[PDB]
Specification:
The PDB classes it as hydrolase/hydrolase inhibitor. Keywords: HYDROLASE-HYDROLASE INHIBITOR complex. The complex is a heterotetramer, with 2 copies of chain A and 2 copies of chain B (about 5 residues). Chain A is an alpha+beta fold and about 300 residues long. In chain A, about 20% of the residues lie in helices and about 25% in strands. In chain A, the strands form 2 sheets. Chain A has a 7-stranded antiparallel sheet, with no helix packed on it. In chain A, strands 8, 9, 10, 11, 12 and 13 form a 6-stranded mixed sheet that branches. In chain A, strand 1 and strand 2 form a beta hairpin. In chain A, helix 3 packs parallel to helix 8 and helix 4 runs parallel beside helix 7. The longest helix of chain A is centred in the last third of the chain and has 14 residues. With about 5 residues, chain B is an all-beta fold. Chain B is elongated, with a radius of gyration of 4 Å. The termini of chain B are close together. The chains are: A alpha+beta (about 300), B mainly beta (about 5). Chains A and B meet through strand 12 of A and strand 1 of B. Strand 12 of chain C pairs antiparallel with strand 1 of chain D.
């Protein structure tokens, strides 16, 4: 028993982390087969970062100007190009630790694990969510760019995030593994701000289902609501509007517990307007929004990875 | 923003 | 910026996980060099669990009765012995994935990462603290026994925990890697109860330093306090008493934030007495106590 | 307690 936010085991990703250095700029890269992926802003030293013309700035760079380091070993770069906001280095050695993998672009609300790295050295791992405002509330210091987010399915690593920057509010922005940013953000040290964020309603509902699955069910009531009536209430508390698509995603959790989604929405509505009144839910005093419906199934089902 |  | 309940990367430990089966019982084992460590209760049946005698049960086993598998592959057990509440199985081949490691017994209040496993396969990794009552608030299903807790420094894994049991309140109990239980628990299925838990004051102060370092500052105040005055209050709220040693430990974070430890204590004192009133600290509406000072320093450098 |  118990219910914890868990990261995926990070071994398969650890085996891919390398160090990429241009001049005095050192950040992390992702080594898969004979390609190293990293943030293109690695090529910038000093204040180049204000308004870089990456395309031209890159044209000057040579292969020997990239110092790629994997453990105690320097990897020989034999090619380089740009793909959107990512640099792609071709090295002369295919990574023997390459796991089965996939590049995916995730949707706002979806969760993933982040392996925080510095100088190519994995340092910590944590679970987080892509916020509705397209940022993540991570924990990153200087030199963490190139750190990746990922999920694991059976034996396949789905890479879904590479870290590029910290916004003025202390939250974080980055790209998919095709180099395309999540959100309207661009990779320059200009002024950019995150939009107002909302609570991930779909995930809260999943978590309430989690609670019920674990015998924590005091908040359930004998009423229901229409979707529209739920949204009218929830949006006042800064919750994402709930859609019929979301309702369908909660199907399996609804079937398992025998609780219709709108009946649960009625529970959630009552919880928002009245608070908990001292009680807790899965040991939390707060309504949790970083577990997806699928996270809940995976955990309550002891899913493992090969 | 800061390029980290 | 930002502050997350962060675990150590689990790869070095993943490469040590194996499956140990006895008759109809399967658990996880830890495979280092040519030894596999697992909980001794792997040799118990349904009947044997109310009051097992592990010496009796163990003598009735041979090497051949232990099925050890690394992935799909069976490892030949060529030796067995008991070290407290652990079984040690010698196998005829060495784990090339064995990291630099050591076994350490941690103290209550310290933190470590847990690699939750089933059938020798990693499921997830999460960070937690050893409660003052020696339990862990874990997430463990059937078959998770043998999962280990660990810390990493440089390239050296310090194994500090192996999971054995779930108590009736639903919290967790285990041993160090010599098989000695944390707390007065035994590996048998009798009603056992955890001592009343308490809040790890030292960690709460560290976490308030983490808050300050990330701009969360509203709880600070002009006051200061003495150690004794602080303790008289915290103890009313079931907080562990703070000692000079604990004050000293908070020194570096004190220096970094320019907030005196006893000033931070006064802040905490007012929080305990007045509550938080709607407000949050680092996203939480309660005081977090599963971060040590060293954890805070590491993550917030 | 349950042996887990």
């Amino acid at each position: 028993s118990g219910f914890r936010k868990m990261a995926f085991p990070s071994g398969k990703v650890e085996g891919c982390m390398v160090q990429v250095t241009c001049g005095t700029t050192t950040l992390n890269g992702l080594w898969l087969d004979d390609t190293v992926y990293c943030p293109r802003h690695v090529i910038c030293t000093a204040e180049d970062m204000l308004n870089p013309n990456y395309e031209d700035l890159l044209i000057r760079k040579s292969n020997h100007s990239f110092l790629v380091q994997a453990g105690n070993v320097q990897l020989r770069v034999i090619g380089h190009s740009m793909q959107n906001c990512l640099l792609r280095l071709k090295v002369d050695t295919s990574n023997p630790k390459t796991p089965k993998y996939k590049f995916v672009r995730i949707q706002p609300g979806q969760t993933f694990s982040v392996l925080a790295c510095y100088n190519g050295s994995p340092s910590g791992v944590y679970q987080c969510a892509m916020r509705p405002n397209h940022t993540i509330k991570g924990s990153f210091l200087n030199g963490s760019c190139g750190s990746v987010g990922f999920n694991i399915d059976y034996d396949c690593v789905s890479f879904c995030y590479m870290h590029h920057m910290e916004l003025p509010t202390g939250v974080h922005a980055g790209t998919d593994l095709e180099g395309k940013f999540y959100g309207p953000f661009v990779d320059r040290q200009t002024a950019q701000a995150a939009g107002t964020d909302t609570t991930i309603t779909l995930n809260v509902l999943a978590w309430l289902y989690a609670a019920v699955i674990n015998g924590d069910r005091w908040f359930l009531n004998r009423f229901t609501t229409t979707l529209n009536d739920f949204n009218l209430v929830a949006m006042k508390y800064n919750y994402e509007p709930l859609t019929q698509d979301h309702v369908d995603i909660l199907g399996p959790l609804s079937a398992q517990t025998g609780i219709a989604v709108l009946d649960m929405c009625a529970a959630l509505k009552e919880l928002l307007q009245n608070g908990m009144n001292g009680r807790t839910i899965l040991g939390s005093t707060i309504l949790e929004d970083e577990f997806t419906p699928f996270d809940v199934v995976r955990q309550c089902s002891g899913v493992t990875f090969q | 923003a800061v390029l980290x």
